[PDB]
Design a protein around this nucleic acid. Structure first.
Lengths: 117, 88, 51, 100, 271, 55
RNA sequence: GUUUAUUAAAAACACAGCACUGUGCAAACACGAAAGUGGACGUAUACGGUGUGACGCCUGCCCGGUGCCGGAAGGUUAAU
RNA sequence: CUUGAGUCUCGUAGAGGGGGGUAGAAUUCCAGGUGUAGCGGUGAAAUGCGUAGAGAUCUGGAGGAAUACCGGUGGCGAAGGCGGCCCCCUGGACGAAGACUGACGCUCAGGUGCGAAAGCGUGGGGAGCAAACAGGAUUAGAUACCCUGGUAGUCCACGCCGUAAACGAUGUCGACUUGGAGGUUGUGCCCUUGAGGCGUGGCUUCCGGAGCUAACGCGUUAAGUCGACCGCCUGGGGAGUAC
RNA sequence: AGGAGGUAAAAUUCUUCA
């Protein structure tokens, strides 16, 4: 089904799990893959390696469309922030662009408090 | 804060001449002018306390000036209250 | 923020984040709101910036 | 009677009406013995960010020495006029010329 | 404007008047009036179908137009009148043709405004036009469910609807109840909010203050006897029964909605 | 610097992200610093200086 | 204020108020085999049911049983 | 009479105050397209959410509140307190000279006004956050710390409350007394001929003298050295309570 | 060398007079 070549790599790494979704130049998502979905529960997925295999997981599910090259928009800090884009490149994808889209509000909502540990 | 047009105008009505703004009558005159101007200013908003003390300071200022004038020459005092229109 | 590499290389080389955003302004507006407490912190650090 | 920057931008579609705006504007001002020391029309210029959809707008610089009356009732015309997009009046500090 | 009377007498100290200065004082527009009698909670069979209906002060009907078909014809609001039949206020508008009609005077309405209906009417309170031309999100009241019928949604005071969807030839409206019902955009509507909102700020003050309104005393099922109400009579404040109607119908949660015809026009029930 | 329209002089006082560069680097003066920043704030509003590089 | 007309006029009932819940219109509900009508020529600040009963301070603990509001793998299961 | 204290001319800087608009990002809610068994969360899990299609992703819309970067022992005000941008209205402070009034001054019981947050009354609104409360964990016990939800409240108009570690824990005003390093705001002079050079005022920060103090320390803005006036304390608990 | 980020989870109590 289908046969694209240019897409996007919307990754969302956090302090718990890293979700990677390979979409097209339209933003409809062709296939995704999480660090937790491939196992690794708790601190297991809270590591850069969890995102590494996660990328390969999303890769081995989107190549069915013949995705040659695709952009990469990083979102959310935490682990698997750099190792993630380091996988797609080694997966055989022609990296083109890499832009950051981490939601940065100009001081609006009021963040939580409870964290006394 | 009271255009320079009104200020110079008042000075040439109470004092012997121009540049005589230092006169007691001139001061109490230019002060009351604002007290009546800002009078309408506070008529609106009414939530401007910071600028309220200023108006009060202006009145409390002329008030002490009246006691002084009334202290020295009494005639100049009456001829001022009836003209300027105040004290009741 | 963004990087448009040339051709002869694949390495990230995106060490720009470690000089602006990344966490220099993210970690700040992450935990407590502080408010007036920062002043004491900056004043304390500024007191150690002399010697 | 003080100075006002005034720098609004008309929608690219209503660019033919722009030359008319300056007419009524300058007219309403001169009507109250107003002034005018500068009037520039950079024309359809590029935008920095997608404002209210569409790219590139029609900027029209201005500089008038009108009183704090006819100027206050000027924005009401801009807001009511869906044609123009943005609007802004700035400081006073005497008058200027050319530049930009 | 809300007013709180003083304790000049019992049943008058708990009264909170809700008057309006910008409200006309006198007789309404005769040309737009009719009989409008009072039934009494009884049908053609003379049987009291609806309980708690009786008495009340004599009322008259006000010819109000909810369809708003006068398109391309501006109109000026002459004044604002009180409509007993409803909880909102009516506005006697005068179009440029010389025809007068009553309409649910919106929130930001005044005497001397220029309202108009049609697929060209400017997006403002007091104007009516199909939702197919009204921008999404626009708070609208007196919405219709069918193109040509008339406004039936959000007609009370302080109430309002908000368009929040499109898709196809329909649009989802966020009813004041919190439910989102789908209605074909072909249906017209009036931007802005309905009449006053201080209607819910009322508290009457006394019992007789509710009698001349059309409401009669309320009897409890526990006070009545078993032969009259399922809750039995008891022998000193007793119950032991389940909160039901005087006909054997569960209550306090027991839903009684059966349609299946308009369920499709529903997205998310209230909450 | 002395104005906001002179974007050709305020474009070298801001980083690539649009963030206003501190006086610690630019070595600008004191009074001229706030004025320089005040000018940028005005330009940004008039869509003269992008708030962020995300655009 | 109302009530056992004709042994009980009371602490009973009603009561403004408050709360829960049902109801998106051809409403719920009710009178009716049906039509139709009432509810309402009203539209959630509306209406119906229930409970309590101005106001002031407040209204705790408990979901097994009996109901109600949902979900659901498996099991049993009518007509045919 | 003029040196105190004021007025007047011109000019300069500012999150000072009040009112009315406006812009962007993000979060939440909602809708459409694509997509599918996970999502979310923690130290580890779980409650919760999802086959009525979440999360993720793309586009659009509404709403509330707060204004990233600038931003700093930086600025302003009597104190409390005060941060996007623009308009309107407005107080005070300060500087360069000259002129004028001529002690018109300082403080001040009563009294009066203002006065964070929280709370309360009559309404509206309500994204996020979040007492109480509800449901999961931790534990010997957990009416708490932790997690998932969440009302009042926070926001706005008006009317009250007038309470704080409301502090610089130092009342206000005036005069005098060795200095050094910076911030910030005017102004005079000089090939402006260096982005400066040479002086003079207001305000502010750190350190440091004498001196002062029990010590800590403060230290030209004093707790130093003096003068004026008001308030207040006389062991702690009782008690910021009782009448 | 200057700067930024990251980096600890909970775990009580111990008579009186010298």
């Amino acid at each position: 089904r289908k046969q694209v070549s240019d897409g996007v790599a919307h990754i969302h790494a956090s302090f718990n799990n890293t979700i990677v979704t390979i979409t097209d130049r339209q933003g409809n998502a062709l296939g995704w893959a999480t660090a937790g979905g491939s196992g690794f529960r708790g601190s297991r997925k809270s590591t850069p390696f969890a995102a590494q295999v996660a990328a390969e997981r999303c890769a081995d599910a989107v190549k069915e469309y013949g995705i040659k090259n695709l952009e990469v928009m990083v979102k959310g800090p935490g682990p698997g922030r750099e190792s993630t884009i380091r996988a797609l490149n080694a997966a055989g994808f022609r990296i083109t662009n890499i832009t950051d889209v981490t939601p940065i509000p100009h001081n609006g909502c009021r963040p939580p408090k409870k964290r006394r540990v | 804060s009271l255009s320079t047009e009104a200020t110079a105008k008042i000075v040439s009505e109470f004092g012997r001449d121009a540049n005589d703004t230092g006169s007691t009558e001139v001061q109490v005159a230019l002060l009351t002018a604002q007290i009546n101007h800002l009078q309408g200013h506070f008529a609106e908003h009414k939530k401007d306390h910071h600028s309220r003390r200023g108006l009060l300071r202006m009145v409390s200022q002329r008030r002490k000036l009246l006691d002084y004038l009334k202290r020295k020459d009494v005639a100049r005092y009456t001829q001022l209250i009836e003209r300027l229109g105040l004290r009741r | 923020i963004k990087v448009r590499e040339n051709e002869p290389f694949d390495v990230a080389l995106r060490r720009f984040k470690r000089s602006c955003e990344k966490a220099g302004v993210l970690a700040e507006v992450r935990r407590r709101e502080f408010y007036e407490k920062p002043t004491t912190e900056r004043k304390r650090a500024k007191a150690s910036a002399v010697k | 009677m003080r100075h006002y920057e005034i720098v609004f931008m008309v929608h690219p579609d209503q660019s033919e009406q722009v030359p008319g705006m300056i007419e009524r504007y300058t007219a309403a001002i001169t009507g109250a013995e107003g002034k005018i020391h500068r009037l520039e029309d950079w024309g359809r210029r590029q935008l920095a960010y997608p404002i209210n959809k569409l790219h590139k707008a029609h900027y029209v610089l201005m500089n008038v020495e009108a009183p704090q009356e006819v100027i206050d009732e000027l924005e009401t015309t801009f807001r009511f006029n869906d044609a123009v997009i943005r609007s802004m009046v700035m400081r006073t500090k005497h008058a200027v010329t050319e530049a930009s | 404007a809300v007013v709180k009377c003083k304790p000049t007498s019992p049943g008058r100290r708990h009264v909170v008047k809700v008057v309006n200065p910008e409200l006309h004082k006198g007789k309404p527009f005769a040309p737009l009036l009719e009989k409008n009698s009072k039934s009494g909670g009884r049908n053609n069979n003379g049987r009291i179908t609806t309980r708690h209906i009786g008495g009340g002060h004599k009322q008259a009907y006000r010819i109000v137009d909810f369809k708003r078909n006068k398109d391309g014809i501006p109109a000026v609001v002459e004044r604002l009148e009180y409509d007993p039949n409803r909880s909102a206020n009516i506005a006697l508008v005068l179009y440029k043709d010389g025809e007068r009609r009553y309409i649910l005077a919106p929130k930001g309405l005044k005497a001397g405004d220029q309202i108009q209906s049609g697929v060209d009417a400017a997006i403002k309170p007091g104007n009516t036009l199909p939702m197919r031309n009204i921008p999404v999100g626009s708070t609208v009241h007196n919405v219709e469910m069918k193109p040509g019928k008339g406004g039936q949604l959000a007609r009370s005071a302080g109430t309002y609807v908000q368009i929040v969807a499109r898709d196809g030839a329909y649009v989802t409206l966020r009813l004041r109840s919190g439910e989102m019902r789908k209605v074909e955009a072909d249906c017209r509507a009036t931007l802005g909010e309905v009449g006053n909102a201080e209607h819910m700020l009322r508290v009457l003050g006394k019992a007789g203050a509710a009698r001349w309104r059309g409401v009669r005393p309320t009897v409890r099922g526990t006070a009545m006897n078993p032969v009259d109400h399922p809750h039995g009579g008891g022998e000193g404040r007793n119950f032991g029964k389940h909160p039901v109607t005087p006909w054997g119908v569960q209550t306090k949660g027991k839903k009684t909605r059966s349609n299946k015809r308009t369920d499709k026009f529903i997205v998310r029930r209230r909450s | 610097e002395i104005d906001y329209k002179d974007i050709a002089t305020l474009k070298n006082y801001i980083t690539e992200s649009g963030k206003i560069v501190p006086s610690r680097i630019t070595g600008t003066r004191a009074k001229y610093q706030r004025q320089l920043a005040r000018a940028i704030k005005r330009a940004r509003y008039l869509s003269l200086l992008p708030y962020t590089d995300r655009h």
